[PDB]
């Protein structure tokens, strides 16, 4: 019966492939050919925040577009003030091997995690005038790659044990487990309506999940190597990925296939992070060749280059109002562009 | 600037003073990476070693230096996504078991991966060959033909040790890398000094390379 069930997989595989071709009558580049080009985008460095003594691995903006949080291998968690270049808090960490961080939408909590296989929650606005550990979440069997907040009592995490999970902070227990990947999960993006999210893993595939029901809806496979970054379109009906094959791709949900590919013949290094603009016209990506590129999301043309770092660029971010872009690197510095 | 603004900048300056003080203390430390297979001697490599899953960290003080050892064996995942964290380490310690005839060809394969990694082009390796008392009490019963079918030579213990060590040294293809070998037993209690000598010779070579002689 194993052979019959193995063959039934191939029968259902060709049906999905044939259905996608039946709904593909034109390409995005063909439709968008009669559009004026964006032009040349030039951005200058306005702020240079310094104080970290090792590599920076992650950062996250606040909702007010004023405050930041960054994580480094020196066991520190610093909250910055963009406008005046000031330090507000400095949080020591029990473990120095941290790989991700996040900022709560309400501005009351932050989180971090890494090779200790634990996600930690911190309380910022409290009496006694100091930051204190509020909760430690345990249960994963691999390192944490990413985490994002839904509200003050819910969080979603991805791990290197090929699983995703949804936690309740007060009870400290999982409520749903997301399974189906065959490789380590590296990235995670959350929809604006907080009802769906997507993930990218080392098996060169992306999956779309439903939070309420905990089941997989669609799967996307176009890359030739592992995926390092992922992000939604501002509308909520498309997303973009970045892989180690030196390529970014755009996927659509309703048509359920790929639309555009962003590649150049003189780029060999991989991609660390991706981000969009407020109108969804510019796509920003970070690379291992010390540079950050700006792409045209519709014409698939290169529009600008940001070059100010002496080491690998590892994290990106765009504010809610779309007024500035902040980049972090392995040279223990981060800059704000406008 | 307002009165409350001048009070904010003073708080920032005191924070920057604390960070600078913490960096100086952490700079005068020696960091080492501990690697090997299961049940090989990683956990009991130094008798005076204290502990202070994910990653296990142990530390000890010898002479006037502080040593930090990191063991990462509980990470049963892909190594290529987190191996670059330990890029600025001083050296690598690799432990192998001579008695286990089945752990070999897995220790050798793992040795080849780390020794030819992109992030460890110029990182020295200290090699430990454990359980020499059991190896000399097993070679008579098992003439090394199980682990190495293509082996011709005397069945003496000394010749077997020289053959195993040469197999591990054959995986090095680099001109700025050296391997220090040492054979130890379970009852031996002289291993902090062996690491002290190996680290001392590494810094001397590093300083010579900066001058340009070597």
């Amino acid at each position: 019966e194993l052979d019959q069930l193995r063959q039934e997989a191939e029968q259902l595989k060709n049906q999905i492939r044939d259905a996608r071709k039946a709904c593909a009558d034109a390409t995005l580049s063909q439709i968008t050919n009669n559009i004026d080009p964006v032009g040349r985008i030039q951005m200058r460095t306005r702020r240079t925040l310094r104080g970290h003594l090792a590599k920076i691995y992650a950062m996250h903006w606040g909702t007010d577009s004023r405050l930041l949080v960054s994580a480094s291998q020196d066991g520190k968690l610093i909250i910055w003030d963009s406008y005046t270049t000031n330090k507000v808090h400095a949080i020591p960490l029990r473990s120095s091997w941290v790989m991700t961080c996040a900022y709560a939408p309400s501005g009351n909590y932050v989180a971090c995690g890494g090779l200790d296989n634990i996600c930690s929650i911190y309380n910022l606005k409290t009496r006694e005038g100091n930051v204190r550990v509020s909760r430690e979440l345990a249960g994963h069997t691999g390192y944490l790659s990413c985490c994002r907040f839904l509200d003050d009592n819910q969080i979603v995490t991805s791990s290197g044990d090929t699983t995703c999970a949804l936690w309740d902070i007060e009870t400290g227990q999982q409520t749903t487990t997301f399974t189906g990947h065959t490789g380590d999960v590296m990235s995670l993006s959350l929809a604006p309506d907080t009802r769906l999210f997507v993930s990218g893993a080392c098996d060169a595939s992306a999956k779309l999940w439903d939070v309420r029901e905990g089941m997989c809806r669609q799967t996307f496979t176009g890359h030739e190597s592992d995926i390092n970054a992922i992000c939604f379109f501002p509308n909520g009906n498309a997303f973009a990925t970045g892989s180690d094959d030196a390529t970014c791709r755009l996927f659509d949900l309703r048509a359920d296939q790929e639309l555009m590919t962003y590649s150049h013949d003189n780029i060999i290094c991989g991609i660390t992070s991706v981000s969009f603009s407020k109108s969804g016209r510019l796509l920003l990506a970070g690379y291992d060749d010390f540079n950050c590129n700006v792409w045209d999301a519709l014409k698939a043309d290169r529009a600008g280059v940001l070059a100010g770092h002496d080491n690998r660029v590892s994290c990106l971010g765009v504010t809610d109002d779309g007024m500035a872009v902040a980049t972090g690197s392995w040279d223990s510095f981060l800059k704000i562009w406008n | 600037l307002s009165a409350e603004d001048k009070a904010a900048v003073e708080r920032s300056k005191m924070i920057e003073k604390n960070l600078k003080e913490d960096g100086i203390s952490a700079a005068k430390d020696v960091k080492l990476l501990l690697l090997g297979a299961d049940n090989s001697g990683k956990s009991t490599i130094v008798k005076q070693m204290k502990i202070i899953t994910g990653i296990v960290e142990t530390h000890f003080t010898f002479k006037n230096l502080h040593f930090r050892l990191f063991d990462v064996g509980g990470q049963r995942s892909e190594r290529k996504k987190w191996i670059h964290c330990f890029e600025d380490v001083t050296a690598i310690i690799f432990c192998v078991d001579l008695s286990d005839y089945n752990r070999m060809h897995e220790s050798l394969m793992l040795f080849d991966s780390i020794c030819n990694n992109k992030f460890f082009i110029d990182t020295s390796i200290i090699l430990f060959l454990n359980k020499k008392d059991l190896f000399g009490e097993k070679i008579k019963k098992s003439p090394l033909t199980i682990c190495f079918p293509e082996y011709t030579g005397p069945n003496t213990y000394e010749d077997a040790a020289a053959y195993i060590q040469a197999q591990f040294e054959s995986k090095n293809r680099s001109p700025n890398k050296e391997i220090y070998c040492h054979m130890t037993c379970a009852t031996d209690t002289n291993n902090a000094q062996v690491i002290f000598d190996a680290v001392t010779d590494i810094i001397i070579a590093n300083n010579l390379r900066g001058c340009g002689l070597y």
Epitope: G129 | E4, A7, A8, E10, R11
Partner: single-chain antibody, 230 residues
Framework: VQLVESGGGLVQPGGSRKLSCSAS????????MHWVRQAPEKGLEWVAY????????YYADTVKGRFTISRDDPKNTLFLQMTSLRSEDTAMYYC??????????????WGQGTTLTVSSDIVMTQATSSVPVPGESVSISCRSS???????????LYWFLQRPGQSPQLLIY???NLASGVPDRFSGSGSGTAFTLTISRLEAEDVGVYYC?????????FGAGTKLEL
């Protein structure tokens, strides 16, 4: 959080006295401290201030050259040394904590004080003194000689409430932000040189004296105070 002050007594004119305050419940070394005194039948008056880390010290013009302020972090204690005491120094002295960073609420905790018996500034005006008033809306006004709005977009005005027999409590900081633990029926709004505090659905535990205070520049100055009766 607790702040207990010790000292006090009766001292002849020309003498000296030392006052101390103890802290228990919060990170002491991260907070700045103030001394504020109130005459037996008058309002509030700022005296001295020492920064977190002991780098900035400020004094009022009345007590300059006679008073000295100091702190001892490991023992969590604040001191005030007084010399050449006159008859105008008879008052009740308070200890106030304040922390300064983006988004903080200074002057958020006061401590019960001690009584001592010895026997180019901004003017803040509270025209009204007493207003008789449950289940009603009341408004209190305030005025300043100099505009309290800075070029960064911040207006510095603080509202305090002091019930009889109790220390003052913070109500509104900046100009409109509501302090933690305060019911949502208190609102604060205004413009340059004109400010108003509004209470909706008045209830019990709302009778007392309301004070203005500006934090634009040193020395800090208060208002006369408006009293609610019945």
């Amino acid at each position: 959080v607790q702040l207990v002050e010790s000292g006090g007594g009766l001292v002849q004119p020309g003498g000296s006295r030392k006052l101390s305050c103890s802290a228990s419940g919060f990170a002491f070394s991260s907070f700045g401290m103030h001394w504020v005194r109130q005459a037996p039948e008058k309002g509030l008056e700022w005296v001295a201030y020492i920064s977190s880390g002991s780098g900035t010290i400020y004094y009022a013009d009345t007590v300059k050259g006679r008073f000295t302020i100091s702190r001892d972090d490991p023992k969590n204690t604040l001191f005030l040394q007084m010399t050449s005491l006159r008859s105008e120094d008879t008052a009740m002295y308070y200890c106030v904590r304040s922390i300064y960073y983006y988004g903080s609420s200074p002057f958020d905790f006061w401590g019960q004080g001690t009584t001592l018996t010895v026997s180019s500034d901004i003017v803040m005006t509270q025209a009204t003194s007493s207003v008789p008033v449950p289940g009603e809306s009341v408004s209190i006004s305030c005025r300043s000689s100099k505009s309290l709005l800075h070029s960064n977009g911040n207006t510095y005005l603080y509202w305090f409430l002091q019930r009889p027999g109790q220390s003052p409590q913070l109500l509104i900081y900046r100009m409109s932000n509501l302090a933690s633990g305060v019911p949502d029926r208190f609102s604060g709004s205004g413009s340059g040189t004109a400010f108003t505090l509004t209470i909706s659905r008045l209830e019990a535990e709302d009778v007392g004296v309301y004070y203005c205070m500006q934090h634009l520049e040193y020395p800090l100055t208060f208002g006369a105070g408006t009293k609610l009766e019945l």
